[PDB]
Amino acid sequence: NECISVKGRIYSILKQIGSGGSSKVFQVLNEKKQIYAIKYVNLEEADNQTLDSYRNEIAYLNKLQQHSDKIIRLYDYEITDQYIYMVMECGNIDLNSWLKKKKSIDPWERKSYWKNMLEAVHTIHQHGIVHSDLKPANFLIVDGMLKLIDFGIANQMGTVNYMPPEAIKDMSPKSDVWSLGCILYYMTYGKTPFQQIINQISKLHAIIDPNHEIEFPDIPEKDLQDVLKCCLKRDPKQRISIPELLAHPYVQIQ
Template identity: 30%
Template sequence: MGQYITQLCKYFKKEAHCKVQQQPTALTLSIKQRTIINYNSDGYDSDFEEEKVTIQKEPVTIKSWKKGVFLGQGSFGVVYQGFDLQTGRVFAVKQIEIFLVDKESLNSFYKEIQVLSLLKHPNIVEYYGCTNDGTHLSIFLEYAGGGSIAQILKKFGKLTESVIQKYTRDILQGLIYLHQKKIIHRDIKGANIIVDTRGVCKLADFGCSLIGQQSYSLKGTPNWMAPEVLNQQESGRYSDIWSLGCVVLEMLTALPPWGHFDNPLQALFSISSKKCPPPFPRNISDNLRGFLECCLQYEPKQRKKAKELLNHPFLQIKSPKKSLKSTRIEMSQLEELRAIPHQDESIPQAQREDQKSIFSDLSSLQIGDENQQFQ
């Protein structure tokens, strides 16, 4: 256990620092080599082509841009808001300074480019391109104005079950898409799930992800890691399901899973050695409790698949109420309103006559009449 904790501390203390980039040139993916591997882990029983990536320069899609406000710190790299000076588009840009990061961080950066270039889904952050100016590497990404789930929890506190239900459905849709493509995210947590202004969740930060094979390595964030990951046993898509359960707990409590421990080492010990999930809040629905139990089984193969979880009773949406829409009162409706007698005798007769007169005047207006002029 001690060596695992040492590796964790070494891995998660890395930081990257970025400066303003002036004249970026593009990095695009060129697939130079393909190897066929047989991937039978976690129910994948078909051959899958693992793509190895190299980088070459091409004209950049975002040619002229300005860096804006700081948005957050990823597992590697710093994220800023960006503004396209030619199109006016607002985007997010993740940057690392090449000479201030180690080889592992650079590999993670390239890995994220590789994975994002393969993906197109409404519940996954959209990839616009990447640049290299010789000093900085930058990834241009979709900007979601709502921030991450972690930021939302920090601002507004724990979420209601109805919001958790909606967010969880979105996350699962993204995971289903990833797992169908034989991609494992390996770092599902609130900070890596962004929310747009419509309330749509999108998976982000693919630097730890893995394509088409099982893993025995430590990747992710400790409190959200599945037991098999911390114990460096075989891990796969079921490890993402454990992390999803941890995100649901995070949304319920506005705290990290195992957040009741003062010492993070206690959390690591509990995850890796105790065959029990993080504690659940008491006042939750039976359906939500059942959903958490499906995600947080100690044995990976006992956890439900993402597609199965989407059909869980907790996520079945009831008939939605009609959304509030802007409406205009038609003249016929005004006539009906004018015909309704006033029952409130406390209103003076003169005032009631004035109200009738107003409705009469409104009903006589010809909306859209080109011959009508207002002085």
């Protein structure tokens, strides 16, 4: 429960939120006992390829401020040769942990969270960023809304269930549509489209191979069932885009 100093301001560690691959996230308090979330990154083992990934992520996160409130608020940051300190907004819970704990999600709650997800991905697309690795863990519940925490530029610490078929064949902004579709599918049927296929090798084949029909059981919300069919199209040309999804009846009609 040590102390942290960022750009002259002192912060006391309250509790550690999480840890993963030379990185750590802590609950901190300023002199006025106001809460913040500080991300600490250890750079002693990272090479120039990994270093440029963190630098690019920090730059885009700082630029995305005031552009949208669907991106985590970054108040200040400190970068040295040894470490990175990022003073951010403190949230309630990540979407991945919240989805696993929830028994059944409300239809209005599913719609409101989908809208937030579309608007955050649209904002990063407008600034030329393509996430390519979207999963619920990249989203945080804060101030009664969902906010994107990372843009997938830097290597961080589920599995291959949200991977688009284009990325598997590559050995496009439409890639983020498939990943978002898998999150909404989980919010609709309680499972991912390829969660039943336990074998990782057999799972990767099922995503890319055509004729392997993805089940879409009938639900009262006919517009919601349509979004999933449009989002989970193996062909990126036939797949719906983010600006088209923002005008879909599911997000615009009551």
